[PDB]
A = this chain, B = another copy of it.
Amino acid sequence: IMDPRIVSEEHYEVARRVREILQRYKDLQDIIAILGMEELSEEDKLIVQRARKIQRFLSQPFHVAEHFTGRPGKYVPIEDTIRGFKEILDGKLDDVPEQAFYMVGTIEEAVEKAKKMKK
């Protein structure tokens, strides 16, 4: 189903942009372990910072996982999945800490959680 004729235009764009930023980060994180993060350029630093947040926002608390997560469980509809990933790709939430995306649901919760974290 990941064909431009079947899905919406922004669904196709957001899905292809997620794979490119994470594929770029995958090859670059290996280098950082030997050269150190101080030696890489500003475009690389920006890709690392956004890729970390994207990779964590892919996480979600399941209803069947309450015993393993200590959380109640949440459902996210397709429009909210597309809307949430787009703000991260466009850099809107560069200020939010990378620890505000673990086991969360909708993107509004990440901003509320950052306020609870006093930031």
Residue numbers of A with Cβ under 8 A of B are 31, 34-35
Contact = CB atoms under 8 A, between A and B. Distances in A.
A114 B30 CA distance: 39
A30 to B, nearest CB: 10
Nearest to A31: B34
Query: Majority SS of interface residues in chain A?
Result: helix
Nearest to A35: B34
A34 B35 CA distance: 8
Contacts of A35: 34
Contacts of A31: 34
Closest 3 CB pairs of A and B: A34-B34, A31-B34, A34-B35
A34 B34 CA distance: 8
A77 B31 CA distance: 46
A35 to B, nearest CB: 7
Contacts of A34: 31, 34-35
A104 B37 CA distance: 43
A31 B31 CA distance: 12
